[PDB]
């Protein structure tokens, strides 16, 4: 059937014949004149795909991190776990600030011309919810963060009560949860099945209504992140091999199956058997490399500020505002918070989008911020195959300087 070789062909290998039928039809289409067509006709095959990316922004973020930090097990986090989450901690301070300073160095938005701020003490007591169904029900992504991670820690200390009444009761709880948060990424499956018709519509009548420049700044974007990106390996990955005695050179030898694989695949958590695979080839402990890969499938943000690091500075550039160091920094350290313990779950792109237009303050009501944010919507795939071979190297990183420590 058609529609069963439709859905047959691979997602990554759609998006992109998309895409690029998109920005053909909508330049050779732009030029001859028909463009308000496209604008009443293809367009809302787009808009809806923009709505559908944030349907599932929410219940995958409070239902993710509640069934994520109740899996934390006090007594598993000893040695191991402390010196990874250091690490971590180390490193997306690297990532955000070459992240920035690549998003600086280009200037991702500057000819797209297409025509306030709280205290510090402020957003940390925002951070904490008045009311949990209320930030639910509104936007609110960091206060049900934290009320997430709050309701994930407190089932923990029922499960493991002396009763057995509030025992099954927190087990059913979660276990309900986490049906819904499998139930959410069933979902993201058929909307990426339907993304290639979203993208092609998006970049179709966004080349229709501006023109080459378009193409001209969005191979800019693309370039910002990998650039910084390959510049995050051999400036940080590169160097805490050297520093800890471990050659980089054979590490890069040894980890290109699984940075291949993680750059076709687009899921760092698809990954995992081949990326264990290497672990056990470079004679890393079967322990070390079984607790730190699966922690490093969740919770790592490497590539995320990478991509929010200069997709926010594209998204302030088009539309017109201009931004300074320490007012970006307050933005990028604000959604790379946002995206924390969300980034391996296959819901990832709804997020890190999402948290783009919450980044801006504008709404999806004014035509000028529906024509900058779906330019980036189109490009998010290029963008998340790098994201995510950064993320696999990350990991196979901050597993072999823990070896190496342990060992």
Same mark, same amino acid.
């Given at each position: 059937?058609?529609?069963?070789?439709? &859905?047959?062909?691979?997602?990554l290998?759609?998006?992109?014949?998309?895409?690029?039928?998109?920005?053909?039809?909508?330049?050779?289409?732009?030029?001859?004149?028909?463009?308000?067509?496209?604008?009443?006709?293809?367009?809302?095959?787009?808009?809806?795909?923009?709505?559908?990316?944030?349907?599932?922004?929410?219940?995958?973020?409070?239902?993710?991190?509640?069934?994520?930090?109740?899996?934390?097990?006090?007594?598993?986090?000893?040695?191991?776990?402390?010196?990874?989450?250091?690490?971590?901690?180390?490193?997306?301070?690297?990532?955000?600030?070459?992240?920035?300073?690549?998003?600086?160095?280009?200037?991702?938005?500057?000819?797209?011309?297409?025509?306030?701020?709280?205290?510090?003490?402020h957003?940390?007591?925002?951070?904490?919810?008045?009311?949990?169904?209320?930030?639910?029900?509104?936007?609110?992504?960091?206060?049900?963060?934290?009320?997430?991670?709050?309701?994930?820690? #407190?089932?923990t200390?029922?499960?493991?009560?002396?009763?057995?009444?509030?025992?099954?009761?927190?087990?059913?709880?979660?276990?309900? &949860?986490?049906?819904?948060?499998?139930?959410?990424?069933?979902?993201?499956?058929?909307?990426?099945?339907y #993304?290639?018709?979203?993208?092609?519509?998006?970049?179709?009548?966004?080349?229709?209504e501006?023109?080459?420049?378009?193409?001209?700044?969005? #191979?800019?974007?693309?370039?910002?992140?990998?650039?910084?990106?390959?510049?995050?390996?051999?400036?940080?990955?590169?160097?805490?091999?050297?520093?800890?005695?471990?050659?980089?050179?054979?590490?890069?030898?040894?980890?290109?199956?699984?940075?291949?694989? /993680?750059?076709?695949?687009?899921?760092?958590?698809?990954?995992?058997?081949?990326?264990?695979?290497?672990?056990?080839?470079m004679?890393?402990?079967?322990?070390?490399?079984?607790?730190?890969?699966?922690?490093?499938?969740?919770?790592?943000?490497?590539?995320?500020?990478?991509?929010?690091?200069?997709?926010?500075?594209?998204?302030?550039?088009?539309?017109?505002?201009?931004?300074?160091?320490?007012?970006?920094?307050?933005?990028?350290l604000? /959604?790379?918070?946002?995206?924390?313990?969300?980034?391996?779950?296959?819901?990832?792109?709804?997020?890190?989008?999402?948290?783009?237009?919450?980044?801006?303050?504008?709404?999806?009501?004014?035509?000028?911020?529906?024509?900058?944010?779906a330019?980036?919507?189109?490009?998010? /795939?290029?963008?998340?195959?790098?994201?995510?071979?950064?993320?696999?190297?990350?990991?196979?990183?901050?597993?072999?300087?823990? #070896?190496?420590?342990?060992?």
């Open positions: 059937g058609l529609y069963r070789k439709y &859905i047959e062909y691979p997602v290998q759609k998006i992109l014949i998309g895409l690029i039928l998109g920005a053909i039809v909508g330049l050779i289409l732009g030029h001859y004149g028909y463009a308000h067509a496209v604008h009443t006709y293809v367009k809302p095959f787009g808009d809806l795909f923009v709505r559908l990316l944030c349907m599932l922004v929410m219940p995958i973020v409070f239902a993710s991190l509640v069934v994520g930090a109740a899996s934390i097990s006090p007594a598993r986090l000893g040695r191991v776990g402390v010196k990874i989450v250091v690490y971590y901690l180390l490193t997306s301070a690297f990532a955000v600030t070459l992240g920035i300073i690549m998003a600086r160095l280009f200037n991702p938005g500057a000819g797209i011309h297409l025509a306030q701020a709280p205290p510090l003490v957003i940390l007591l925002d951070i904490v919810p008045t009311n949990p169904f209320g930030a639910l029900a509104n936007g609110q992504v960091l206060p049900t963060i934290f009320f997430a991670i709050i309701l994930g820690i #407190a089932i200390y029922l499960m493991n009560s002396e009763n057995e009444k509030v025992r099954k009761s927190a087990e059913t709880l979660l276990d309900a &949860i986490n049906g819904l948060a499998e139930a959410m990424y069933k979902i993201v499956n058929g909307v990426m099945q #993304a290639p018709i979203g993208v092609f519509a998006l970049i179709a009548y966004v080349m229709a501006q023109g080459v420049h378009v193409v001209g700044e969005l #191979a800019k974007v693309t370039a910002a992140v990998y650039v910084g990106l390959t510049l995050q390996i051999l400036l940080v990955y590169f160097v805490l091999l050297k520093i800890y005695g471990i050659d980089p050179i054979s590490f890069i030898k040894h980890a290109k199956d699984a940075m291949l694989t /993680a750059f076709v695949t687009r899921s760092s958590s698809g990954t995992l058997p081949v990326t264990m695979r290497v672990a056990k080839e004679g890393i402990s079967e322990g070390i490399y079984s607790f730190t890969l699966p922690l490093g499938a969740t919770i790592n943000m490497d590539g995320t500020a990478l991509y929010q690091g200069v997709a926010t500075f594209f998204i302030a550039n088009a539309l017109g505002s201009h931004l300074t160091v320490g007012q970006q920094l307050t933005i990028v604000t /959604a790379v918070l946002a995206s924390i313990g969300t980034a391996g779950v296959p819901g990832a792109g709804a997020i890190m989008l999402c948290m783009v237009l919450h980044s801006v303050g504008l709404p999806l009501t004014d035509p000028n911020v529906a024509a900058a944010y330019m980036i919507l189109g490009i998010d /795939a290029i963008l998340d195959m790098g994201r995510t071979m950064v993320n696999v190297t990350g990991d196979l990183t901050g597993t072999a300087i823990v #070896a190496k420590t342990e060992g």
